[PDB]
Design a protein around this ligand. Structure first.
Ligand SMILES: Nc1nc2c(ncn2[C@@H]2O[C@H](COP(=O)(O)OP(=O)(O)O)[C@@H](O)[C@H]2O)c(=O)[nH]1
Ligand SMILES: Nc1nc2c(ncn2[C@@H]2O[C@H](COP(=O)(O)OP(=O)(O)O)[C@@H](O)[C@H]2O)c(=O)[nH]1
Lengths: 651, 651
């Protein structure tokens, strides 16, 4: 067990040994040792090893040097190789139990070696985190309990590997190839939503999740992974991209591959890696429906840290893995791993799937306004820029780290030019037409889910001429992935006089009664404004995605935070709606604060102004920092999150 | 010592016992006990007590019931009264050592009882915090190490009490009256800056702090309190309001009185509690200098939690204590404690100093524009509102808690009307004149110390008429307390045409070359704008205080965070100036991470683009959460702060 403390697997080391490859582990008792892992072990396949109880050393692969011999006892040290395959091993010796071997971010020779402690702590050990959502212009951080070290998750991850397509075809090859984080990476990734029989989650995007758990409701990977195994490995209802990435992160972290979930705003996902996306809108600026895919408000994927021996030297580091399956050249599958640096450099020939990730982040959009006589005019749209605020949690702290710079060079820089050339993407001549006029959507201040509020189409005329235009404003609810719902606010002005060297601000009132019916749990509304000057026949387009704020969840920690001691969390919130909330339910969890997810229903409805308050009983079994993540659910106010860091010291 | 763990005084209990009143403490060995505290103890004065080693109990005051008698040993329990005076006590018994008694936030009967654990943890136990600075429109949180439990601070606080004016006049009364947190409160407060002989800090506000430590340089109370005692209790150079409040908070926390430092923006401090402040400006909007005090950009004071038996029932709770001496009716002294609820209610007759604090938060300002022929016109100024974002650190987390609601009822609410009536302050008829025109200062985006940037006078004409006005823009550096330095950007338009139903934005370029000479360490610049329409002869005034951002200090924690183990903190920053930095110096501290303040000078200058990086060696002796607070100093970039929460687990 003091191996746990040595291998950073302490929480995992309870009633079975679990260690990390490339590092020596204590064992206490001429004879020889033998290890076997797969269901068809073999010597050359690395899945089986025979080694003597020497006294010297001479590394190479597996060794078992002796250290002490306290008369009736015998202390020795087994050493696994830095590239030993991952999995369950059987340990037996000959005259004259089992351990689980994971990747080792701490071992210099391991392919997943992490140069610094804080990063190993964050990307492998810390079980709580954030998934960035909201909007490019108002980023929200959703708390999430990865809980990779929660009870039974490691066993589920091994089951997850042992049931993947490649293990079914040839269990022997699979177990052997599991020495490679890129190989394990592609498996973890494909098992999340792709591989439709044994897949972990079943995606659904239509806002109709009654017969399952809505994607926005999950507050951690643990419950998903459990519902999967406890129902014979059947897809859990339901997930969406951040959920896929989130459980993929949990699995990979459990297994020891440093991983972090990333969010990209204005993501050109599900376009066939196409770098020039065109939309055709009618005279009110409404995109003319069909087979065209909308830009996603945000899209999530994960990044895993490892070396890439299967590619040109120098591509070690972060590798982008997108477990959300997308339409590809020959089928619909997930993507990666591809080195992020390759994406930044425009090296699209690198495996795997470089052109897809490159597009998510660099695609170019053209908005056309179709008119009478089928004439088509290119509108100026300065509001849309693909690949916006690539975010992931900072190492060791709750602040958000912007990693956009790792995927892209500064706009219009020379290095950007190089990358775009290497990617056959020199399209960026910029129309710059500039009617001298500009326009953008302004919000003024934060709005809350449940309230009425004004937003504004803000026009700037930095010219000597006075224009007379028509301005078409339209606001409609949107799913996080682009699906537009019905209009929830419209306004047109047919004779807008824009004075010279001035600015005008036109308000658009958005009412709760108009957006309550179709707003998804992502709380997004998309405001659109089209300004057209009939003389020159110019079209100025501007759009913005608003995020309506949910009420905050107050969290009081009652009692002294000590290991193995009653802890009460009082959670509450105030109903923001002008009507009553029914079926209120608080849900809580967090690796380190409970082994079980806690739930508390509220029998009676919470009226319009009222607050709802309950107390959850916790029994924290671990010292150190842990995030208590909480979710609130009701009939008319869903998926409101909240969290609280709890320290918990010595008993 | 297990008393430490029982009395929440563990860090204090090393080589001398320290406990809290109103609660039993273990003691292990017909006889009777005796306790003496002052230098002139007495029975009725509560400073001396004689009590028998009973076997039953019968509380009342001091008791010494026996519990166990393991043959050669004897375990008993002394119990101090809930209102026992605070201090050093001598314990001796008769036939047939010493403890330090502090206030007890955990004891239901004590005057400082705190109803919940999280609040006791925050306001008494946590030794790290934030002091809000910056500007109403851009709040900055300065890290601060209170370190009330650092080695030797308790002894300094006792010295602090034993050398106060009231102890010099009659040591006997002083020691007795130290049973009252309000009494100890007034003492702690007065000793910080007021009482000029033995005062802790010497205030200075002229930006000339070469022969001492600048107020903005301090990163904790510890070093201040130490320099005080180690130089025979001589005022330390130099402090300002937040520093005074900060050390006052340290002392009060050490002593056990729950305390938190608060910041108020646009604070009408140092006006003689006057509720109607008037300024006379010339034709450019410049205030015409003299004896008039400027509104402070922000002002800080502390709040201590206690009951108020010396007043009408119901005034228990937070009490505002302002250790910054201000001009009063008869002399210049500090103020409070006054119940915050009394200030909210307008109950100005409550002791102590209610009308002063009431003014800080409620004063009304009138801006007059003097003209030719000595005619004076009242300008409309919607940009200034006194008492803005009363802030203090949240309990248990790093987020800022807005406590403005505790000092004031909503604007124009009925309760506000009541409070203003009880305070003879019904002045709020509102001019509402509204030329239909409005104006405010806009910033666009964050600017950094060291860069050039534009701000804007944003004019709104929601009228059918077209006006032709003159706009006078002026930007000047300012100290946090209102002291205007020389202008650093001006623009004067005499024929500004404002078109009907339009907005105009006029830029004012502020250059580093222009503000580098006089900017204070608070990084504040005050933009002013006066728009006058000559026809009706109307004056519109708008002002705003900008905060220039300092570069961030990156903090890497090298090694595993374990009790009693080498810990290396790598701190760095990137020079934001277009010129070189010389005399660079990093300073670090934090109760729980070092017993000593660490310093590291950088021999060579840091050039214009370059980064500076160094490593500090720490030896953390305590488990749990601790903030490592850091300060960077140099010739041309001063007082830049930074911090990092470090967890530190079992050895
Ligand atoms: N709730 C919410 N607040 C927003 C959103 N966008 C902006 N805000 C907030 O509204 C204020 C102004 O928005 P900002 O983007 O800074 O400027 P503006 O939109 O150009 O006026 C800021 O306090 C923002 O944090 C949004 O989508 N949702
Ligand atoms: N560094 C700095 N940033 C500021 C300051 N005031 C506002 N900002 C930031 O500038 C942006 C716009 O300012 P805001 O007050 O929201 O609106 P505006 O001033 O009316 O345009 C936001 O990102 C603010 O956080 C200031 O004094 N200093």
């Amino acid at each position: 067990e003091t191996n746990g403390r040595d291998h950073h697997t302490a929480d995992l080391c309870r009633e079975k040994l679990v260690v990390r490859r490339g590092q020596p582990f204590w064992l206490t008792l001429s004879l020889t040792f033998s290890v076997v892992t797969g269901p068809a072990p073999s010597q050359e396949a690395g899945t089986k090893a025979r080694f003597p109880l020497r006294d010297a050393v001479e590394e190479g692969d597996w060794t078992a040097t002796v250290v002490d011999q306290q008369d009736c006892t015998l202390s020795l040290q087994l050493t696994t190789p830095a590239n030993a395959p991952i999995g369950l091993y059987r340990l037996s010796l000959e005259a004259s139990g089992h351990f689980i071997l994971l990747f080792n971010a701490w071992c210099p020779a391991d392919a997943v070696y992490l140069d610094s402690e804080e990063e190993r702590q964050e990307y492998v050990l810390t079980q709580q985190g954030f998934i960035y959502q909201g909007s490019a212009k108002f980023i929200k951080n959703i708390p999430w309990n990865f809980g990779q070290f929660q009870d039974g998750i490691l066993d589920i991850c091994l089951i997850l590997l042992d049931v993947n397509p490649k293990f079914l075809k040839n269990a022997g090859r699979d177990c052997s190839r599991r020495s490679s984080p890129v190989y394990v990476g592609r498996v973890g990734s494909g098992m999340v939503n792709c591989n439709d029989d044994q897949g972990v989650l079943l995606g659904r995007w239509d806002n109709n999740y009654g017969d399952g758990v809505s994607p926005m409701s999950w507050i951690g990977s643990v419950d998903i992974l459990r519902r999967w195994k406890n129902h014979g490995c059947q897809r859990v209802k339901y997930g969406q991209c951040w959920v896929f990435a989130a459980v993929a992160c949990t699995v990979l972290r459990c297994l020891g591959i440093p991983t972090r979930v990333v969010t990209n705003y204005n993501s050109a996902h599900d376009q066939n890696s196409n770098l020039l996306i065109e939309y055709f809108r009618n005279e009110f600026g409404e995109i003319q429906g069909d087979k065209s895919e909308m830009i996603w408000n945000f899209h999530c994927w994960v990044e895993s840290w490892m070396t890439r021996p299967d590619l040109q030297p120098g591509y070690e580091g972060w590798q982008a893995l997108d477990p959300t399956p997308q339409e590809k050249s020959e089928g619909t599958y997930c993507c990666g791993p591809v080195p992020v640096r390759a994406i930044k450099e425009g090296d699209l020939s690198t495996k795997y799937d470089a052109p897809f990730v490159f597009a998510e982040v660099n695609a170019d959009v053209v908005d056309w306004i179709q008119q009478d006589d089928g004439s088509v005019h290119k509108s100026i749209n300065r509001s849309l820029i693909v690949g916006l605020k690539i975010s992931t949690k900072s190492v060791g702290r709750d602040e958000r780290e912007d990693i956009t710079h790792t995927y892209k060079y500064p706009e219009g820089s020379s290095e950007e030019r190089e990358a775009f050339t290497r990617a056959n993407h020199l399209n960026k001549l910029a129309e710059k037409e500039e009617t001298g006029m500009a326009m953008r959507i302004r919000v003024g201040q934060s709005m809350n889910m449940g309230s009425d509020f004004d937003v504004f189409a803000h026009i700037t005329n930095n010219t000597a001429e006075e224009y007379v235009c028509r301005l078409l404003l339209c606001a409609r609810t949107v799913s996080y992935n682009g699906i537009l719902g019905p209009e929830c606010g419209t306004k047109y002005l047919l004779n807008l006089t824009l004075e010279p060297f001035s600015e005008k601000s036109v308000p658009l009132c958005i009412l709760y009664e108009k957006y309550r019916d179709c707003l998804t749990e992502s709380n997004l509304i998309k405001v659109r404004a089209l300004l057209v000057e009939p003389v020159i026949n110019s079209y100025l387009l501007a759009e913005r995605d608003l995020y309506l704020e949910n009420p905050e969840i107050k969290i009081r920690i009652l009692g002294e935070p000590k290991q193995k001691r009653k802890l009460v969390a009082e959670v509450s919130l105030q109903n923001p709606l002008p009507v009553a909330l029914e079926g209120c339910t608080f849900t809580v969890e967090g690796a380190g604060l409970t082994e079980e997810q806690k739930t508390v229903e509220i029998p009676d409805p919470v009226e319009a102004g009222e607050e709802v308050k309950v107390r959850m009983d916790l029994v924290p079994l671990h010292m150190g920092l842990h995030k208590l993540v909480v979710n609130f659910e009701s009939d008319k106010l869903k998926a409101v999150k909240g969290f609280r860091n709890v320290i918990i010291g010595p008993a």
